[PDB]
Amino acid sequence: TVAYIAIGSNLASPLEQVNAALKALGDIPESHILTVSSFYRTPPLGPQDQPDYLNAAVALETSLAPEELLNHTQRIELQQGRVRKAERWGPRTLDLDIMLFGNEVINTERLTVPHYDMKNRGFMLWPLFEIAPELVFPDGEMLRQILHTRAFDKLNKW
Question: Which residues are the active-site residues?
């Protein structure tokens, strides 16, 4: 099954962290990376002007069950990143999200697939469209149509 994972990071030197996360993803059992998008740049959230986020998408072929893959992405988030001490609840220094898992729809307590907000997020959709331009969502919606219709701004490259 091809899973699509979003990776995000702003902390320390994002290139170094993201590459280490990519290696970890490749090391997940019963799985291999098929392709990785370009690295994209997205401006911080909040007027306070934080570092830029590095964003990318990964296509991972896997024979793991969806919640097994979740275990691994959570483990990698724990091993490769941390919470922000002031904003324990905020995003972690390294974010991994399963956006899609083949054509499966999943609504469990620990896992919601497709990612519940991804159709609203250019920073998820654009890298995905680079590596899967003909992607169709389980509900039948075409990735290309969402980008075209909703007229998202492109992202700059990292």
Answer: 82, 92, 95, 97
